């Protein structure tokens, strides 16, 4: 099992995108997904002010600049991987479809309809 | 005890003592519309069930004993298994295909009873 | 006579003869939503009261005599004062803190009665 960095695609997919401190970061994760099987690691990041949200074309927004210095601390809680592939398999970061970021939290929930009427035999007569 | 649907895995005769627990749980313009549709629907669904109980002569009751005989072809089981072994979910699946037949028969026996009671007055 | 709430200052036993008077009075997109919310609410409030009367076995009645004993701890008064001296507003304040207890007891006596009536059939 080998890890590799992302495959070609646009910036919004090939990098780790997130919004923090009010600004949109595009970080290069190749330093995290470069290994066979299994200080600190520094990932360089790019910043954009013009943002095309989700996968839409036609609605762009301008992120106002944020005054001062931005520092964010967060918890990585999971990964979205895609398998590149019978003797070896390579996993790469993937995603870009935001539904998979919610699918990961809503997996425990199901919605059901209550149907309160029912009939059953009993030994009685009106 | 347990609240809403806490009896779901209990047997049919252990359950059906909690009928009031479930009965009471049936009760920017775009968000306003979605919320209203959810609320109107809850009301219409509630009223369809109440109308149907009214048609069958079971208005105002949670347990209604009728005069329709049970067909062994709907479920050939003895009361001991249905009420002491099975859960309501299992039962609902077992007789799903006969529900419309049963409902039709309940409507009909009520129409006859209701007319007979008029003739007696 | 007087219409809606005209009996509000009358004594409890002078009032309660006008129950149908009050019962019948319970029944640009933004304005449309506000009006609908007011109307949906009126319906939901109405139905919650009707559901509750149904649970207590009082469906279809304005005056419903039940089988729950009165606790002297809820209000230690004789019928003569409650019905001939007090108004309904005063009474509601007097026993406000026992309302939920009373409602719980009414629900329970109905569940028992309803089951006993099934066993008798």
């Amino acid at each position, epitope marked *: 099992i080998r890890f590799a960095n992302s495959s070609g695609g646009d910036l919004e997919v090939t990098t780790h995108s997130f919004n923090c401190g009010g600004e949109f970061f595009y970080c290069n994760t190749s330093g995290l997904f470069n290994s066979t099987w299994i200080d600190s690691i520094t990932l360089p990041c790019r910043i954009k002010q013009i943002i095309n949200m989700w996968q839409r074309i036609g609605q762009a927004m301008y992120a106002p600049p944020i005054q001062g210095v931005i520092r964010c601390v967060s918890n990585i809680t999971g990964l979205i991987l895609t398998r590149d592939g019978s003797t070896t398999e390579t996993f790469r970061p993937g995603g870009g479809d935001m539904r998979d970021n919610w699918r990961s939290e809503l997996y425990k929930y199901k919605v059901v309809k209550i149907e309160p009427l029912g009939v059953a035999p*009993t*030994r*009685c007569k009106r | 005890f347990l609240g809403f649907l806490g009896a779901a895995g209990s047997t*049919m*005769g252990a359950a059906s003592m909690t009928l009031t627990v479930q009965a009471r749980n049936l009760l920017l313009t775009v968000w306003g519309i979605k919320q209203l549709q959810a609320r109107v629907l809850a009301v219409e669904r509630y009223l369809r069930d109440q109308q149907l109980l009214g048609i069958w002569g079971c208005s105002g009751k949670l347990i209604c004993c009728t005069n329709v005989p049970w067909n062994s072809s709907w479920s050939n089981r*003895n*009361l*001991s298994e249905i*009420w*002491d072994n099975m859960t309501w979910l299992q039962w609902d699946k077992e007789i799903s295909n006969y529900t419309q037949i049963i409902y039709g028969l309940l409507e009909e026996s009520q129409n006859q009873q209701e007319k007979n009671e008029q003739d007696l007055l | 006579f007087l219409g809606f709430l005209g009996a509000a200052g009358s004594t409890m036993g002078a009032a309660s003869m006008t129950l149908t008077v009050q019962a019948r009075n319970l029944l640009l997109t933004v304005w449309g939503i506000k009006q609908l919310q007011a109307r949906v609410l009126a319906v939901e409030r109405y139905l919650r009261d009707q559901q509750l009367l149904g649970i207590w076995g009082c469906s279809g009645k304005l005056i419903c005599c039940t089988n729950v004993p009165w606790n002297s701890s809820w209000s230690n008064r004789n019928l003569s004062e409650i019905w001939d001296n007090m108004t309904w507003l005063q009474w509601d304040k007097e026993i406000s803190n026992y309302t939920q207890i009373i409602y719980g007891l009414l629900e329970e006596s109905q569940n*028992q009665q309803e*089951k*006993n009536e*099934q*066993d*008798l*059939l």
Partner: antibody
Amino acid sequence: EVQLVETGGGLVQPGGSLKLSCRASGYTFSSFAMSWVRQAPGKGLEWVSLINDRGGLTFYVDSVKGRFTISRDNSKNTLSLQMHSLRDGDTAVYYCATGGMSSALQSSKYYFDFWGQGALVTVS
Amino acid sequence: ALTQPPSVSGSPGQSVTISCTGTSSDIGSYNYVSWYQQHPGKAPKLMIYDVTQRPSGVSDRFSGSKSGNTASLTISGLQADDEADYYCSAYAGRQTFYIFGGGTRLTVL
């Protein structure tokens, strides 16, 4: 194996009262309806009273209807029968018996499955 | 109530029949006619219930049936251990729940 054990006094004067009881074991008490049956010293059996499994419904033979009370307590596994007024004609062995009715959601019985040995009650 | 006061008898190995006569709005219309066996000094035991059924623990020497307004209990391979009083009873509807007949003494010869 189940047991029904009748207890209670066996001697009263007419015009008085007497409480009998029946302790049950070996089965779920609360699942069965129960009755009392009299055996007159020189005759046969007579049904006197029946109580529902939950204690909600009670039935009596007309001859004791205004005098006897049948009660049940499912937490102690016991029945009780409270006799009042009492006549010489009420002398009998009073048997505790399991059965008599049904619970609606279960097959009916309408017969008596288990019997105790009986308390002897004499009205002098 | 129900009736059958005389004794019934036969020798070991002979069958005997015990009748129980009631009325239409009683034993005739309700198929709930149990039979009980009472050895003197003991509480009665259930032998037959409903009409033909027996409790587990009851031998097949005991069986029965009904017709019209009369029920009966049949004992086949009569034993000395069958010397007991037998009673029939029946569900007699609501209000009058149960009635019993007098018992019959079964004598083994």
